[PDB]
């Protein structure tokens, strides 16, 4: 369950201008996939509390 | 620099088979998954062929399916393409294509040169060039017309590369089983009727050599 | 440790609710002979981020006048609007 | 409130080129919690600061203010700046005043290049009344009412030495934040970009 | 009280990046650099197990 | 599964402004990854991600968009883009293609230069006949070539040859080849392939008889 | 025997590119001590590592393997890698595997730039047997002896990222070495070298 999950990229230019948003991505939505591992365990159940590790 | 370097390809007629090869190096092939693309001159693109690092998983689009088959060699680290049942959609040309990961798809990275795959059924053809004569200024246009041939690559160079930078290749049009180009080459005033203007034709299919030298009409 | 890992660097606890009594008061110089550690910082690092600046001498301001203090919520909301 | 106002937040944008004499002035700032300029296009709005959404509901404040520059320069530029605060009002005549002059006034120096990146400065309270107003909400002057202890220059101490293949310019952040604030005398009003 | 999966309200968190300062090179220095994102839970605690897929 | 679209199909640009190209789909697709086909070789490395520009493009290109619209954002137009561009999506099996968008660099109008000529002899002996009309160093793409066939305009034989843009004076050149036979060639006198120009009021006449020389 | 076999020699070489992008795989390892690929060629020989030359004379072996990567960079390149361990045998399809999908796996990651240049990789034992056979001696695949306990897959996790008066690569040696190790019924085999 706790363990890091590469969930999303992306890619900072010399293009951007100033206050530009480079990534906006839903951090517990990314991580409900069949590619991770924890998908094993939140699919059959219905409830859960949590907290968020960022990296 | 990855290296991609095609081989193969022709006339085929339709309901024939052809193997292809792309035969890469300089890099491990057991980290790459391999594919290929179609370039119809009409209508751009279409991808059709997948195989993954063994040779277990194969996966083709609706249209391919049981048509194509692939195979990796990973011992001579080349590649295949066995085509079967041919039919005029597929006269097109064929790149080997590598894939890579992104973070939720994939992704191309280096296509080779490609070959040159044409499907329909007359013979092979050599060309018939004749030339392009005026009936008066510091620029006079010259050319030469090919016409007549049905394998698609020739090759129309101005005395071996000396006038290129002054060259206008119009392309081909295919009129009745049979393509028509015309080179058109710009000559200074001194130079024509003065020195020797000629036009190289090389026609690799038939191994065909014609030069026409323009005279004054 | 709950989760088994393992960590050196440390991001430490961010905006501490109600640090400070917001009426001017007392709990001699506030600043003065000793060279100033906290004139020069960086501002990346969140251990180093709350320590008190000082770069002039100063000393103590005073208590105000007014006995209740207008910067809490319970009284400035206390009015009705 | 105090959970708001000590907390720095952006409140300005200034570049120092490699083009500049010593001694020319890049910037001034006057001395207020009522102080930001920045702004968005997408969507529209005017950006503010913590500590200007917290003294822009009072008829009084005082206390000293901290402003925090942050630098961004590569490892191998070189140069010094000069921080200058005069103590007066909002409205003075200031740009008069030389690069040897502003020595007489508080200052302090930076070195860009190191390991640290930030310099935390804080203003002392210099005034001749207990409290200083707030006058945004009027539109007409009047001597002796004001909204400033003083005004700040920011020099150039230094010029700006630097490789061929680097940039010519280092991009510094002016922040805001608050120690000892004191305020009272509720009312309404939203503010307005101060465009210096 | 909880997060539910397989119906949800509005999400919890929402991570955002933004640029601070703009990018700056000069001749041949490479115009981009890449990024990532790592995550991952803590103090995992699951109810009420379900059979629907 | 489903399939791409592009909006424009060829765009014009001088050299100094603002190109803006759109790519579309009617299933909505996470990342979009582009590819630039230049004129005799193959496409490279253009677009990974959604907006991340290869190792070897300049600064100034972009890319931006999510679910159904997607743009390749283009500041300054400059010298370097005489390409074909191409949207790829890459959700479930499919992998589908754009349309493709022919980015031309427009250059300022010039007048058609004309010089036809007739049939050679051994064409003429070989049973049929080309009349191959010519033009050179012209703006726009888009002309208007008609036949002037003793007085009348005949439609049936058009075969007409179109290069793409030269990389040196940025010009377009043209072919008009109009295919007849031996007996038919020797039924009129009057030739004349006339190349109607927008700015250029009446198209210009370049004329030869048949029965000369 | 351990004098030989718990030093490590070089192995493998790769290089990493500058014009890679994300996720692209760069290097595939079957995980066993017969592992080796380096050659020369005056004079000429197929050059061998130390473990493989203790290993190659035993029916069985067992036990941690130990990866030595070792980068030679400068100290202006920036970039991260990613080293994930798949369990299984020497023939599985792994390069469906997406940048994504390999942090389920056990993973690691490693930054270039710094003061040490070499990470070692300590591999689980991971079976369903207790020994793990030699097969090289044979000529015939069969389904349940096998001669690894999974792959490994280099990744490229961040872009190298440069200037211009540097080079556009960073080379990698990869070391190997053994511990805990176990072996026993002996015989004769002379190793050919594994062209991955």
């Known amino acids: 369950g706790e363990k890091f999950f590469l969930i999303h990229s992306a890619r900072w230019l010399t293009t951007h201008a100033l206050f530009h948003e480079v990534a906006k991505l839903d951090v517990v939505k990314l991580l409900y996939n069949e590619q991770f591992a924890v998908q094993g365990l939140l699919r059959y159940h219905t409830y859960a509390r949590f907290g968020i590790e960022i990296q | 620099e990855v290296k991609l370097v095609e081989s193969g390809g022709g006339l085929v007629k339709p309901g024939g088979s052809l193997k292809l090869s792309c035969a890469a190096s300089?890099?491990?092939?057991?980290?790459?998954?391999m594919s290929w693309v179609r370039q119809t001159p009409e209508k751009r693109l279409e991808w059709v062929a997948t195989?993954?690092?063994?040779?277990?998983?194969?996966y083709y689009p609706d249209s391919v399916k049981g048509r194509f088959t692939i195979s990796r060699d990973n011992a001579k680290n080349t590649l295949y393409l066995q085509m079967s049942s041919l039919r005029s959609g597929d006269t097109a040309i064929y790149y080997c294509?590598?894939?890579?990961?992104?973070?939720?798809?994939?992704?191309?990275?280096?296509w080779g040169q490609g070959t040159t795959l044409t499907v329909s059924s007359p013979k092979t053809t050599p060309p018939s060039v004749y030339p392009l004569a005026p009936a008066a200024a510091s620029m006079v246009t010259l050319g030469c017309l090919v016409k007549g041939y049905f394998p698609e690559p020739v090759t129309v160079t101005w005395n071996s590369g000396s006038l290129s930078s002054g060259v206008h290749t119009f392309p081909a049009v295919l009129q009745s089983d049979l393509y028509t180009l015309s080179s058109s080459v710009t000559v200074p005033s001194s130079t024509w009727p003065s020195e020797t203007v000629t036009c190289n034709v090389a026609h690799p299919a038939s191994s065909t050599k014609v030069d026409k030298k323009i005279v004054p009409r | 440790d709950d989760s088994g890992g393992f960590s050196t660097t440390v991001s430490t606890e961010q905006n501490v609710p109600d640090p400070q009594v917001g009426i001017t008061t007392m709990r001699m110089d506030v600043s003065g002979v000793q060279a100033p550690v906290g004139a020069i910082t960086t501002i990346e690092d969140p251990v180093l981020a709350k320590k008190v600046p000082e770069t002039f001498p100063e000393l103590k301001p005073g208590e105000s006048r007014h006995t209740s203090d207008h910067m809490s919520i319970y009284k400035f909301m206390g009015r009705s609007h | 409130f105090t959970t708001w106002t000590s907390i720095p937040t952006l409140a300005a944008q200034f570049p120092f080129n490699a083009s500049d004499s010593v001694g020319q002035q890049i910037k001034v700032i006057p001395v207020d919690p009522y102080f930001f300029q920045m702004t968005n296009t997408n969507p529209d709005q005017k950006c503010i600061t913590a500590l200007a959404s917290i003294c822009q509901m009072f008829c009084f404040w005082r206390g000293d203010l901290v402003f925090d520059f942050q630098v961004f320069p590569t490892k191998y530029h070189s140069g010094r700046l000069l921080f200058c605060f005069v103590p007066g009002n909002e409205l003075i005549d200031v740009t008069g005043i030389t690069l040897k002059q502003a020595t007489t006034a508080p200052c302090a120096v930076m070195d860009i290049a190191g390991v640290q990146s930030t310099l935390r400065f804080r203003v002392p309270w210099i005034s001749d009344t207990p409290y200083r107003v707030n006058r945004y909400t009027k539109e007409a002057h009047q001597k002796g009412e004001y909204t400033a202890i003083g005004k700040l220059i920011v020099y150039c101490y230094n010029r700006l030495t630097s490789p061929s293949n680097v940039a010519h310019h280092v991009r510094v952040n002016v922040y805001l934040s608050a120690i000892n604030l004191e305020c009272f005398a509720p009312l309404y009003h939203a503010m307005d970009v101060t465009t210096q | 009280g909880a997060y539910h999966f397989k119906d949800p309200q509005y999400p919890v968190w929402e991570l955002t990046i933004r640029v601070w300062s703009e990018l700056n090179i000069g001749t041949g220095t490479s115009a981009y650099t890449s990024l990532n994102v790592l995550a991952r839970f803590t103090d995992l605690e699951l109810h009420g197990l379900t059979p629907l897929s | 599964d489903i399939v791409l679209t592009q909006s424009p199909a060829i765009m014009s640009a001088s050299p100094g402004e603002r190109v803006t190209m759109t790519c579309s789909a009617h299933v909505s697709t996470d990342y979009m990854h582009w590819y630039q086909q230049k004129s005799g070789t193959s496409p490279k490395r253009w677009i990974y991600d959604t907006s991340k520009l290869a190792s070897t493009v300049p600064d100034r290109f972009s890319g931006s968009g999510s679910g159904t619209s997607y743009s390749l954002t283009i500041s300054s137009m400059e010298a370097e883009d005489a390409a074909t561009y191409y949207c790829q999506q890459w959700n479930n099996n499919a992998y589908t293609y754009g349309g493709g968008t022919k980015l031309e660099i427009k250059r300022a109008d010039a007048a058609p230069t004309v010089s036809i000529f007739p049939p050679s002899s051994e064409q003429l002996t070989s049973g049929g006949a080309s009349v191959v009309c010519f033009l050179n160093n012209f703006y726009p793409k888009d002309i208007n070539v008609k036949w002037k066939i003793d007085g009348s305009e005949r439609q049936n034989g058009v075969l007409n040859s179109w290069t793409d843009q030269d990389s040196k004076d940025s010009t377009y050149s043209m072919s008009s080849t109009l295919t007849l036979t031996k007996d038919e060639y020797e039924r009129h006198n009057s030739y004349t392939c006339e190349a109607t120009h927008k700015t250029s009021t009446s198209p210009i006449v370049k004329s030869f008889n048949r029965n000369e020389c | 025997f351990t004098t030989w076999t718990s030093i490590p020699t070089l192995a493998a070489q790769f290089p990493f590119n500058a014009s890679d992008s994300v996720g692209q795989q760069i290097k595939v390892i079957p995980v066993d001590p017969y592992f080796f690929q380096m050659t020369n060629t005056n004079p000429d020989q197929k050059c061998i590592t130390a473990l493989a030359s203790i290993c190659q004379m035993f029916c069985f072996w067992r036990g941690d393997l130990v990866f030595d990567f070792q980068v030679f960079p400068t100290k202006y390149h920036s970039g991260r890698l990613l080293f994930c361990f798949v369990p299984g045998n020497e023939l599985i399809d792994v390069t469906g595997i997406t940048l994504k999908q390999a942090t389920t796996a056990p993973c690691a990651v490693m930054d270039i730039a710094g003061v040490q240049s070499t990470l070692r990789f300590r591999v689980p034992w991971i079976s369903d047997t207790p020994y793990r056979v030699n097969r090289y001696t044979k000529e015939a695949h069969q389904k349940g002896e096998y001669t690894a306990i999974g792959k490994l897959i280099v990744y490229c996790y961040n872009r190298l990222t440069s200037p211009s008066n540097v080079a556009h690569h960073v080379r990698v040696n990869v070391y190997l070495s053994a511990i805990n190790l176990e072996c026993f019924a002996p015989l004769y085999h002379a190793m050919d070298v594994t062209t991955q």
């Open positions: 300089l890099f491990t092939h057991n980290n790459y998954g």
């Open positions: 195989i993954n690092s063994t040779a277990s998983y194969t």
């Open positions: 294509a590598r894939k890579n990961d992104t973070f939720s798809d994939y992704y191309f990275d280096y």
